[PDB]
Structure formats: structure tokens, C-alpha cells
Ligand binder design. Structure first.
Ligand SMILES: *[C@@H]1O[C@H](CO)[C@@H](O[C@@H]2O[C@H](CO)[C@@H](O)[C@H](O)[C@H]2NC(C)=O)[C@H](O)[C@H]1NC(C)=O
Ligand SMILES: *[C@@H]1O[C@H](CO)[C@@H](O[C@@H]2O[C@H](CO)[C@@H](O)[C@H](O)[C@H]2NC(C)=O)[C@H](O)[C@H]1NC(C)=O
Ligand SMILES: C/C(=C\CNc1ncnc2[nH]cnc12)CO
Ligand SMILES: C/C(=C\CNc1ncnc2[nH]cnc12)CO
Lengths: 540, 540
């Protein structure tokens, strides 16, 4: 026949072929590799997006890495010695604008570290899923939880109520509890705990949250900025025309002064030149490219858009350059000059700490992690089992037990390595749609991830206007779940709308879920009471 | 039979009864009055909401009404005479925080004027609709266009790119053009210009915009504020713990100073005490009341909630008092002391100006008004005609011509009196659902509006935490249109998502529409080109 056919048959007739039940599932070797390659092309974008989002979280280092600065910027701190000249001792404000150089270097190092951590976690998760449960699924850090971890639990540059290490501890404990409950089979009861409309609309809320994040400044293509009256208006003015804000003390005559201890914000206000930022238009070009590649049903759209924007952004003397002419820019260009490197985890490894188990926000974050993971994992796993045609009449696909256990173990390992919890990817559908049916798909994707590493230097130079449209379009894809809501029934409509609008506005998933559940319960209280009272017997 | 029956028969057998075709439509006198009363109860909330929203727009008066102020607040300007003491000449900054007293008095007077203007415009529109076209519909200022006029075209306290008078001129010209195009039957040709997904999702976008407005500080119940990092987080701290922001010039060492000419913002940042403002909880109580009244299908829910919140807020020495102990509070309490008054429009009457016809934003606002009015009026009028069973097979209900003409004339009259465009209300369905079929419903609603006036003093004391949930729930009701989108087709999904997310984030309807249409057109260029080229003959 053909060498492809000899290879297929030889693998099919081997012990390893029987291990994964190749013959019984009607595919031998080459369908598996094609499915794996398609899956990797579909979901490679995590490699950049997750690293960027987690790097913006501030990393493991604190004010201790802020160097003392001079009184005048023109004098370097080492030479800051003279009359009326002194050194400023770093404070909390060193972490924020204007950022201390030491913190910037720490942040870049943590960015590299997190890239490597993501790659390793995804590889190990894929291997475990492929081997223990023997299914053709792919695992990697979740998009929905990335931003919740980076911008809400920890905050921008560690401005949140939970320290990074305690956040990793929370993720670890959540993974352990998930493994426990999956083992003892209470999972269905907890999944039924949440009301239907909140469960349906939480995904749309998270999609809107990601879309909003993609429209900010230090996360995406700009186009949204501060306004003194409406608090949000049309950004995308040139970077040279952006200024910061500070808190002041008003009065009853018109005087104003700066409030000591004001937490200065970044460049968020535009003074002139709206809709003139070249980075915004480059991001728009990338967005349109990804949109076409999606509409024509071409796999790997987001990678093509990201790569085009990044390649354009690698030139050195442009307005959209990823290497601006300063010290940090020169260091970044130096690193990017070497194409391949083997970076080694140094700080994020084993960075757990159980100090903050007392704080309420700790348990809030843990419970939010737990519920999001339970619901999404169960739903996506059952959907993919349906897509592969493994579901029997009773509704189970045999190997569900070990699939859930493997997902929980992967979550725990990701927690240990220092990344947001890992999950199964809907992108795996592509592999199923290509004919792959056994665990070789997962191992192929794992090998492709292992190939991805060795390229840390190139993946470290992704600007926000490259991340951008990927996040926006992930939100677009996630929004499709709104249809399952009966919008004509107020008792079901109101909680869903609250859930959708609270997440992107309060900028926090937990508050959206809490508001939705509270509104649902308050609305249904009368029905609960009447039903229970008729059950008692006073009413009919 | 019964006096009700004699009255019914006597009216039915009279000339006036034949004028509205009473017998032909199977209702004589009392079904009409019941339908009118139900309609008025359903849609009375406009009386407060429209007045508040348009009053926040700043009115017709400019910095010329800012009085000169003293150097120290403890000295009144009249006595501001002494060493090192002087008078500050008002500039633009007088209009904003800290607001000059004269502008506050002007704003209150404009609020009263706008209340009376809304009442008169709604009355005249209802009368014209009921008489010329002879249908049981109700007219009043639109909710969606209210906020677009008040917060986007003109801006908060006249901070927009269009002067209030020129905005009224734009509304006038838009109404005239609508009348012209409707007269010639060319309306349906324009109505097909907008793509389907944009038309479908614009209503959901406007609903989200209203919901966002209802969650702000000077428009609703708070709960959304400013944050240096995420730009939006969880507000509803006590008013005593809110501070303002100002622009600042940073450096490369950590120094900061104020920027001359900074446009100070209102109290938007919370320093401590989150989720502790009593006004927020009172608004939540009103929201829950309205939600119950809606779920149980009780007419007049929003009025009951507004009235409860206002009645609680009318007390004098509480944290949620609508009369705080100052000069303006005392004046407002003085006015509210007299229950009934006959206020006469003094400024907003005949306030047109055609100076700015050159500006592009003028035409942007005009076209946005025109398209919103065209689409909404056509759709709602046809839906209400269907609901009453007047539609024939061909799809017309006879009196459509004069209905559209009456709506256009009402828009023009509203423009003359100084309010946002007037439209037909979906709430009229209630009157139809009760059995009303003729023009007596409109005249009854007009009489009820005429009754509403004479109560300007009471309607003038509505706080934001009373307006609040009404806006939020109007957004909830509007959101129901998302279902008509095929979320699985990207070429139709992406433009709709862009339209939905751009309106509430950029805080402008026109930009959302422009973005949606642009994305739609750019997405389909390949299809248009291929189709036209195959039409030419090169391809097959
Ligand atoms: C940081 O450097 C700035 C200059 O870039 C210093 O600005 C001082 O304050 C204002 C603004 O320039 C002027 O009136 C002074 O003359 C400036 N002095 C100097 C030496 O530039 C600022 O003082 C420096 N930081 C601190 C803490 O002083
Ligand atoms: C406006 O009134 C205030 C008192 O309410 C005056 O006091 C100023 O207060 C600010 C901040 O507390 C200080 O920075 C100023 O030095 C104070 N000025 C004086 C003269 O004491 C304030 O001065 C008044 N406005 C102006 C322009 O003087
Ligand atoms: C509720 C959770 C999403 C978590 N992340 C993911 N969950 C499942 N598959 C994916 N593909 C990309 N990201 C994901 C839905 O937003
Ligand atoms: C597109 C337009 C709405 C304009 N306003 C209204 N249009 C029609 N009926 C109403 N009832 C209350 N407000 C309205 C839809 O938001």
C-alpha cells in the first residue's frame, strides 16, 4: 500500500497499539498524529497569552527588589552623591508608576519563568490525561481563570488583598478538594447546588470580562480610557499624549492640593489626538486577520494573527516597536537576539505559603476556583465524550472516573509549579473532528509542547497589542451561551442579567456570582415559602 | 343592565363613537377607559426618569450664571472685602466640582422646566396619535435616546462637543427629515441599509448602556467607582469617604505635581468602607420591590418602587435624606413644602440654534437619532398593530401612514419644546392586552398626563438612588433581543458582539453603531467581491 500504511498496521498490531485500544476505535497511527497536530495548532496561543497575563500579576517579588533612587533622574543612583542630593528609600509606590527599575527587571525575569512554567504544566497534564484515563483530550491553563487570578485575586503588581504565594496555596487546596469530591462522587450534588440561570450565564459574564480586559491599555490595544465625567470613553490616542491621575482634596472655593499617599495611576487619560495610535491600528489589522482565518474555518487563526503582529513589532525604530530605546528595551532586545535558550524555573517553583488561610478573601477565591472548575470541567468533558461518540444510554463514557482524577492531579501539579489551574480545552474538539480517538493525540500534543520550549527568547517579546484580539475573540466565542436563557421569564432573566453585567463592571468574577445567586434566592424566596407551607398543609 | 352599560351604549350610538369606529372594534366606552388607566399606570415612570436624565445634561445656561466667589468659603462673596481677600472670576471650571452655586440654582430651575416640557410633549403627542391616525397607542420621550442626548451629545453639565441648543436643532432637523422620508414611502429602503445583526443587537447594546448608567454615582445607586489599576471596581462606600481625582505630571524619580487646567472629577474614589452606603441599600430595597411587582405581573411596579424610595428619602435628618442641611437643600425643601404648583417654562422653550451645522458631530448625532427612530418606530408600531389583530395578509394595517406622520410631528413638537425625541411606547401593549381598540385610550392617557402636571413640586425631589433600579430593569427588559442572533456563525456573531460591547464601554451609541457596521462590512468584503466577480464571469 504505502509506507503510511505499513506504519499504521505495524503500530496497530503492536502491544502499545493494544494498550490504547487502537483497533477497537477504528484508527491506527496517522489519524492520531493528524489530530494531535491540528489540536496543537488550534490551542498554541496559550503559550503567549497565559504567560503575559500571569506576568502582569507582579510575580513573587516585593518592594525589597526596588533599588534606592536619586533625587534627579539625570544622575544614576550609584553616582548620587553631592550637595542637596540624596537617595530615596523605596516604598510601596515603587511598585507602581513610575515603576522602579529593579521591579521591572524582576517582572521580566518572572515573565520568562512563567512561560517555562506554563509549558511544563501543560505537557505534564497532557501526558497524565492521555495515559491514565486514555482519552484524546488536551489540558492547559484556563483562559477564564487566568485573568481572575492575575487581576482580581492578586491584582496588578500585587495590589490585591491576597499575596501571590497564598493565592497559589488556595489553588492547591482547591485542587485537592476537587480530587476528593470527584473520588467520592458528590460532584453531581454540588453541581446541582447552583441555580440554572447563574450556571448558564457565568460563561457569558467571563467572556465579557475577557473582552473588557482586551480593550484596556496595559492589557491590550487600548481604545478605552478614563474620563472625568463618564469614567470610560474612547482612548487610542498616541502614548506621548497620555497623562496620569492623582487624588486631591477639594474645597468650597476652588482650591485643590495633592493628597499625601495618593496611589498614582498609569497613563490612562488622553489629552488630544484620539483614534491616532499606530499600535491600535496594528492590533485592528491583527484582529481582522484572525477574524477572516476563523470565518474561513482555517485552523490556527489566532497564532497567525499573533505572529503577524509580533513580527511587525520586532523592528527597532518604529512607533509600534516592541523594543523601545531605553535600558529595559536594550536588555529585551539583547535577550531576543539569541533565538533559542533553555530557561530554568528559579522563583515560582515551590512558592506556596499558608499564612493567609485566615482571611475571608482567601476562602472566596478558593470557592470561586472550585465552582468554576467543577462546572466547566464536567460540562466540557461530557460534551467532548458526546462528540467522540463514547456516551452510552445511561450517560457515562466508562473512563470518566480517571479523566476527572487526572484533571484534578493536573490542577495540583500546576499549583505546585506556580500557574493558574489547568483545565481541559474545548479546542480538543478539532482533534476529535479529525478522527483521533485514543491517547496518542494527547502524547503528540505533549511532544509538540516539549518542542515549544527551547524558544523562550522569542515568546518573551509579545506586546499587549498582540495579545489583544486573541482575548477579544475568545470572549466572542464564549458569549454564545446566552441563548439557553428564557429571557421572557423574569425570575430567570433578572439573575442572569445581574451575573452578566456585574462581572465586567465590578471587574471581579466572585462578586458577579454572589450577586446573581443572592438575587435569585431573594426572587424565589416567596415561591419556596409558599410551596413549603402548602406542603405543611395550611394552604392548598 | 347597569349604569356602566347605559354609558357604554350611549357613547356607542353617538357621533363621537362612530368617529373612532367603536362598534366595528367590539368595545364601547369602558374597555377604553380601563385600557387607558392601565397604560398610564404602566408608563408613568417617564415623568421622573426623563426629567432627571435631561436635567443632568446641564440645561441652557452657561458659565455666565456662575457668580464671583470669595477666597475663603467662610466669607460670603457679598462680604468678601478685606486684606488679602479678593473675588475669583468664574471660568469653565465653575461648572464642575466644586460646582458654583449659581449654576446649581440654574440647574434646578431647568429641572422644573424639563419636567413641565416632558409632560406637555407627551400630552400633545398622545392627542395627535389618537386623533389623526386613530389607534390606541401612547407616545412619550424615549428611554434609549434620553441618555444618548444627555450624556453623549451634550455631556455632563455641557462638557460635550455639541451645545444644547444645537442639539435641539439637530433633533428638529431629524424629525423633519423623518416626516419627509415617511411621506414618500422611501422609509423601507433606508430600513434595509443597516445589516441584520447590527439592527438586532443595537437594542441590547442600548440596554447594557442604560444598565451601566444606572450603576453609576450621580445617575443611580453607585456600586461602581474608580480604581487606579482596573479603572472600575466596587463602589458604594459612604459619601463621606469619597474623594476626587486630578491630572498630574509624573517623572523618572517619583516626584509629582498638579497640572494647571486639570478638569477635576466628582467624588468617584472610595478610600474605605466598601458596601456600607445606606443609599445603596435603600436602592436595593426598591429594586427588589420592583422585581417582585414585575414577577407577579402587577402593573405599575416601577412607580411603586420609585414612590417607596422617594417617600423614605423625604425625611429630613437621615443619611439617605433628599434634603441635606445646606442652602440648596433648604431651598429644595421650601419648594417641596408646597404640594401643588403651576410651573411655566421660561428657558427651554424655543431654544433652537443652527450655529453648529458645520461640525461633524452635529451630523453624527443627527444620523444616529434618525436611524434609531426609524428602526424602533417601525418595529414597535408593526408589533403593536399585530398584537391588536389589525394586520392583513399583505402586512399593512391601513392607518400606518398617519401613524408614522403623527410620530414625526410629535418628534418635531418635542424638539420645539426642548426634550429628546418622542416615540411610541411598547408599554401600550398593556392597554391593548386589556381590550382597548380605538383612539379613546390615547385621549385618556393624555388626560392622565394633564392631571400629572400641577404636581411639579413633588416630582422635583427624586434622588438618583430612586431613579436607579428603574433604569436597571429597563435595561433588563431591553436585553431580551439577543436570542435572534445566530451565535454559531462568525460573520454574524462578531459584528453583534462588537456592537454590544462598544456601546456601554465607549459610553456612546454612535461609536458602537459605527464599529458594528464597519466590522460587518470589512468581514464580508471577500464575499461581495467573489459574488460580483462570478457575476462578471471570470469565476464560476
Ligand atoms: C525628581 O526630579 C524632578 C525633575 O525632573 C524634580 O523636580 C523638582 O520640582 C519641581 C519640578 O521640576 C521644580 O520646581 C524643582 O526645581 C525640581 N527640582 C529638580 C532638582 O529637578 C524633583 O524634585 C525630583 N524629586 C524630588 C523628590 O525632589
Ligand atoms: C479656599 O479655602 C481654603 C479653606 O477652606 C483656604 O485654605 C487653603 O487650604 C489648602 C488646603 O487645606 C492649603 O493648601 C492652602 O494653603 C490654604 N490657604 C490659605 C490661605 O490658608 C484656601 O486658601 C482657599 N483658596 C485659596 C486659593 O486661597
Ligand atoms: C468557565 C471557563 C473557562 C475556563 N477556560 C477554558 N475552559 C475550557 N476550555 C478552554 N479553552 C480555552 N480556555 C478554556 C469558561 O470561561
Ligand atoms: C431602540 C430604542 C428605544 C427607544 N425608547 C423606547 N422605544 C419604544 N418604547 C419604549 N418604552 C420605553 N422606552 C421606549 C430601544 O432601546
Amino acid at each position: 500500500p504505502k509506507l503510511l500504511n505499513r506504519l499504521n498496521t505495524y503500530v496497530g498490531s503492536s502491544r502499545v497499539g493494544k494498550r490504547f485500544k487502537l483497533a477497537e476505535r477504528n484508527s491506527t497511527f496517522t489519524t492520531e498524529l493528524r489530530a494531535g497536530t491540528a489540536t496543537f495548532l488550534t490551542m498554541a496561543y496559550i503559550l503567549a497569552v497565559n504567560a503575559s497575563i500571569l506576568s502582569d500579576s507582579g510575580g513573587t517579588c516585593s518592594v525589597s527588589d526596588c533599588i534606592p533612587l536619586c533625587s534627579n533622574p539625570a544622575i544614576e543612583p550609584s553616582q548620587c552623591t553631592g550637595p542637596g542630593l540624596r537617595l530615596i528609600q523605596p516604598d510601596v509606590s515603587c511598585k507602581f508608576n513610575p515603576v522602579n527599575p529593579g521591579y521591572a527587571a524582576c517582572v521580566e525575569e518572572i515573565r520568562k519563568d512563567l512561560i517555562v512554567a506554563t509549558v511544563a504544566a501543560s505537557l505534564i497534564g497532557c501526558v497524565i490525561m492521555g495515559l491514565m484515563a486514555n482519552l484524546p483530550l488536551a489540558l492547559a491553563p484556563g483562559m477564564g481563570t487566568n485573568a481572575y487570578f492575575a487581576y482580581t485575586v492578586v491584582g496588578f503588581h500585587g495590589s490585591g488583598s491576597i499575596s501571590y504565594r497564598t493565592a497559589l496555596a488556595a489553588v492547591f487546596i482547591e485542587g485537592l478538594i476537587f480530587l476528593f469530591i470527584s473520588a467520592i462522587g458528590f460532584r453531581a450534588k454540588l453541581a446541582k447546588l447552583v441555580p440554572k440561570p447563574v450556571r448558564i450565564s457565568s460563561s457569558a459574564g467571563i467572556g465579557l470580562f475577557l473582552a473588557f480586559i482586551g480593550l484596556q491599555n496595559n492589557q491590550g490595544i487600548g481604545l478605552v480610557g478614563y474620563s472625568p465625567s463618564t469614567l470610560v470613553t474612547l482612548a487610542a490616542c498616541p502614548a506621548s499624549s497620555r497623562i496620569s491621575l492623582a487624588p486631591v482634596i477639594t474645597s468650597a472655593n476652588g482650591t485643590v492640593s495633592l493628597l499625601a499617599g495618593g496611589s498614582v495611576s498609569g497613563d490612562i487619560m488622553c489629552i488630544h489626538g484620539r483614534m491616532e495610535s499606530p499600535t491600535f491600528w496594528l492590533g485592528i489589522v491583527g484582529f481582522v486577520i484572525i477574524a477572516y482565518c476563523l470565518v474561513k474555518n482555517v485552523k490556527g487563526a489566532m497564532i497567525y494573527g499573533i505572529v503577524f503582529v509580533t513580527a511587525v513589532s520586532w523592528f527597532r525604530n518604529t512607533e509600534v516597536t516592541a523594543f523601545p530605546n531605553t535600558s529595559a528595551g536594550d536588555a529585551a532586545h539583547d535577550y531576543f537576539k539569541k533565538i533559542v535558550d533553555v530557561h530554568v524555573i528559579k522563583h515560582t517553583a515551590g512558592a506556596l505559603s499558608f499564612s493567609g488561610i485566615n482571611k475571608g478573601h482567601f476562602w472566596e477565591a478558593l470557592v470561586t476556583f472550585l465552582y468554576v472548575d467543577i462546572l466547566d470541567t464536567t460540562g466540557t468533558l461530557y460534551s467532548m465524550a458526546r462528540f467522540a461518540g463514547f456516551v452510552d444510554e445511561k450517560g457515562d463514557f466508562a473512563g470518566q472516573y480517571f479523566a476527572f482524577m487526572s484533571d484534578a492531579s493536573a490542577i495540583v501539579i500546576g499549583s505546585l509549579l506556580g500557574t493558574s489551574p489547568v483545565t481541559v480545552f474545548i479546542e480538543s474538539s478539532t482533534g476529535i473532528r479529525e478522527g483521533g480517538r485514543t491517547g496518542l493525540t494527547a502524547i503528540t500534543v505533549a511532544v509538540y509542547f516539549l518542542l515549544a520550549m527551547f524558544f523562550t527568547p522569542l515568546l518573551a517579546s509579545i506586546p499587549a497589542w498582540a495579545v489583544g484580539p486573541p482575548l477579544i475573540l475568545v470572549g466572542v466565542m464564549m458569549m454564545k451561551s446566552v441563548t439557553e436563557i428564557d429571557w421572557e421569564d423574569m425570575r430567570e432573566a433578572i439573575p442572569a442579567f445581574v451575573t452578566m453585567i456585574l462581572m465586567p463592571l465590578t471587574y471581579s468574577v466572585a462578586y458577579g456570582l454572589i450577586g446573581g445567586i443572592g438575587s435569585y434566592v431573594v426572587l424565589h424566596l416567596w415561591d419556596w415559602g409558599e410551596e413549603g407551607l402548602v406542603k405543611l398543609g395550611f394552604l392548598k
